[PDB]
Amino acid sequence: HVPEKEAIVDNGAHFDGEQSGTVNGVTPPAVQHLTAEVTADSGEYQVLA
Amino acid sequence: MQDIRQETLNECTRAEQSASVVLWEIDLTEVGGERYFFCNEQNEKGEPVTWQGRQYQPYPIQGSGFELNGKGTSTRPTLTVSNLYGMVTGMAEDMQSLVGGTVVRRKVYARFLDAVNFVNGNSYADPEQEVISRWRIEQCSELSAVSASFVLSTPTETDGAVFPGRIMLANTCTWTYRGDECGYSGPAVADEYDQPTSDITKDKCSKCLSGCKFRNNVGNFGGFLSINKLSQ
Amino acid sequence: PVLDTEGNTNISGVTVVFRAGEQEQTPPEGFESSGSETVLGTEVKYDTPITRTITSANIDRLRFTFGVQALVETTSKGDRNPSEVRLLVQIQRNGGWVTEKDITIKGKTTSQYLASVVMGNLPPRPFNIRMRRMTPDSTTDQLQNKT
């Protein structure tokens, strides 16, 4: 036994979706405060990042 | 042990037995129907059998295959009912093929029926001696224009059920509406597709984050906001 | 384990919060969910403390980041010595400018070093926030302690 009023109810939207756009995916952001220092110790130049 | 009274057990020792009578009660209140009382046979007056004051009407009913066991599969006895004049089909077309109801089988001895079933009148009547079983209808394996066969099952039988009912979700709720976890009791605000309605007959949650935000119960959301656990 | 049989600590700063599953329980509070960062670079001076106003609906916690231009001190010979800088951060509580938190830095560095300190915004409604420098401004060019 099959009814005919099924394609109407089947062509119904899902639970909205609630945006869920790409925007950003898991990719980490840029590291902040990239300070680099120049020092003179033991008569030698050193740099620290 | 069984809840068998002393008198019926004592009677069930002698050689000259009485007549065994089986009566059936189909209860559909839990599903949306009524209580039907059936007996395979009628009294000597051509009248429905009177037991405990109530009446069981005659109708061809036959139960076969009652096998209680602890191992192997469960018990699935078969109940056969005559479908004449379309009487069974009438409720089957209405009560979703008699699925989910309860059946109660009571067996009694002849010498304990009500006095109105005998022309002389039984002086040994005792409307408290019977053996009772209950089962649930599982499916209507075959209902033709002359008969109808139902499969029975134990209420506590497990089949197709899993133990850890909890399921971890991302953006969908897991429980019902207003039942125990959605402690919402205010006016209707949303509907199936998250539309701003204020009518109570159409208030059903969409099982989303937006529904919770609409109903201000996001603190009671069952969907953990992980999502991105497998991408990284 | 983090504690042994005797009881003395075994690991460094570890914070653990446990909640048994029970209805209408309080949510966890140690960790954040969403943060809005606003950048407005300005230098705090001893004579003119810096004031800002906070006006938002959803307030749970507020984090202040503050920086130091340089801290190394050089004498006539040329030897490098660290110095001390102290700042006080205050907010509005029942109309009183009582000091909310302090900060003190002691370490030789000539780099623009920025640190962060968080606080729990218990007072509701838009309010005001300030910081004040306690170390007096350097007169010479030898001390570069600028915050």
Ligand code: SF4
């Ligand atoms: S989603 Fe939020 S509102 Fe809809 S049922 Fe689950 S908990 Fe109750």
